[model samples]
Target chain A: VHLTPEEKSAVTALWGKVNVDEVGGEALGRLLVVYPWTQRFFESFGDLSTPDAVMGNPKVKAHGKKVLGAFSDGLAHLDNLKGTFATLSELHCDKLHVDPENFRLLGNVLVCVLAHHFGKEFTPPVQAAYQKVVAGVANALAHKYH
Target chain B: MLSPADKTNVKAAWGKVGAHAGEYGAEALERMFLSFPTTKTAFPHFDLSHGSAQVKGHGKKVADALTNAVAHVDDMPNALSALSDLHAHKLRVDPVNFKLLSHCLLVTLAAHLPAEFTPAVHASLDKFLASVSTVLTSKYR
Candidate 1:
C-alpha cells in the first residue's frame, strides 16, 4: 500500500498513455484467454470459447472497461484503497466468494498488458510502482476476506 | 528441440499416457485453473468445473495437440507451424501462458505416472513440452 512519491509520479505519469478503453479491454481479454481457469466466475457472460471469442465478446470488453476504470479511479484513492473498493469487496468476496487470490492475478495481468503496451518506459522501477499499486488494490478488493 | 534420448524418453513416457491422455489432460488443465485462475480468462463460454465435460472435451484437444507435437519430435517448428500461427497471430496470446500450462502438465504427469515419471523422464517430458511451447509461441515476434 505504501508507495514512494516517485512511484506515485510513475503511476500518475503512465496513466496518460494507457488509453484505458483500449488497454483495459486488452488486459481483461488476455487474462481470460491466457488463464482459462478464471472463466468459472463468468458463467453468465457467455461465448469465451477462444481468445478471439473472448476478445470479441461484448460483455468481456464492457467488464474490462469498468474494471480498469475502477483501477484508474484507484489512482486517486491510493491512500485509501481499502476504502475505495469496500463495496467491490462485498460483491466479489462477501457475496460471490471469489478466491481473494484472483484479484492479484488480475493485477498481474494488468501489469503484463502495460508492459506490452509501454515496453521500454515500463522500467523495473516503474513496474515496481505498478506492482505496489496493484497489490494495494488487490488487498482492497479482497479487503477483510483476505 | 530434443536429443535422441530425450525424444525417446518423451515418446516412451507419452505412450504410457496412451489412450487415457484425455483424462490426464483434463486433470492438468484443472490444476492450472485451480492453481493459477487467471489463465481461465479466455474460456468465457465453457464450464470449467472440475473434470467437467467442457474441460474434458477441450482438455482432450490440448492432449491431442501434445500428440501433434509428439508426432513431430524432430521437425518441431515446421510440424507445429499451423498451431504456432493460430496462437501467435490468431490468439495473440502472451507467450508466458504457454509456459504456465507446460508447468502444470509436468506436475500433473508427475502425479499420475509415478513410476514412469523418473527424473530422467521428467526431464525429457519437460524439455519436450518446453520446446513444444517454444514452437507454439514462435510467431509472436
Candidate 2:
C-alpha cells in the first residue's frame, strides 16, 4: 500500500496541473449520474436531475471543491496517510452515515476522471500510484465499519 | 452582521494571511497548546510543540478550511455543517476550543498582517468565528 517515490512524484505532478474545482465538479456530476443515491446526502443541491444541473449548483460546486481539495491534501501528506484519513473515515461513517459502498463508487469515478484528464500522462506507474492511494483511502474509510 | 465593506476587508486580510497559512496555522496551533493546554487531549498523537509536523499540518488544514469558509461566506453554515456534525457528534470536541482557536488565529493574522489587521477587521473576523462555533456546536443541543 505504499507508493514508490517516483510513483508519488508522478501522481503529485499530474494533479498539480489540473484545476481541482473544475475536475471535482465534473467528477461529482458523473458520480450523481452513476450513483443517484449520493444525492440523498446533498439535500441542499436542489434538483440534480442532470449533469448540467449539478455542475451549475453553487453548493454542489463547493462540495466538489472540498472533495478534491481533500484528495490534494491527502496526497500532500503521503507520509502520514493514517493521520490524514482517520478523521475523514470517522466522519463519513459515524457522522455523515455514508455507506462504505459510496466510497467505492467515488473511487471508481475518481479513477475514471483522472484517467480521462491525465490521458497519456496517466501511465502505468502513475496509475499504479493512484490505485494504491485510492485503496489506502478506501481501506481507511471502511475500517471503522468493520 | 458584517457590512459589505467589512466582508471585503476581512477577505483581503484573509487573503494575505492565507498565503502563509501553513506557517501561521502551525503557530496558531502551537499557541493554542500553550494557552489552553487542555485542548491537547483532543490530539494526543500530535507533538503540539512549536513548529512540529503535526502542528504544521493541522494548522495548514485549519487555514485551508477557513479560506474555503470565508470564500463562501453567504453559505458559511451550510459549508461547514458536515464538519460541525463531525466535531460535535463523533469527535465530541469541546465547543470552547473553537473560540480558543479563533483567538489564536487572530494573533497569528495580526502578526503577519500588522498593517491590514485593523480593529474593524478583527471585529468582523471575531463575529465570523462566533458564527462558525455556533454552527459547529449546534448539534450538541
User: Model 2 over residues A1-146: C-alpha lDDT tens digits?
Assistant: 58888888887888888899988888877887666546767776687767778768887777888988887787888777677888887777556656565666787798899899879878877877888888777776666542
TM-score of chain B of 1: 0.94
TM-score of chain B of each: 0.94, 0.92
Task: Compute DockQ for each candidate against the true complex.
Answer: 0.04, 0.01
lDDT tens digits, residues B8-96, model 2?
87788888775787788789888877886556656755665666887788878877888888888888778988887777545656556
Fraction of native contacts, model 2: 0.00
How would you encode candidate 1's per-residue C-alpha lDDT over A33-146 as one tens digit per residue? 877656666768998888899999989899889999989998997998889888988787445656666777788999998998888999999999999998999888865552
Clashes of each: 14, 0
lDDT of 2 at A74: 79
**lDDT at residue A135 of model 2 (Cα atoms):** 75
TM-score of each: 0.62, 0.49
Candidate 2 — which pairs collide?
none
Candidate 1 TM-score over all chains jointly: 0.62
Span of 10 residues, lowest total lDDT, candidate 2 chain B: B87-96
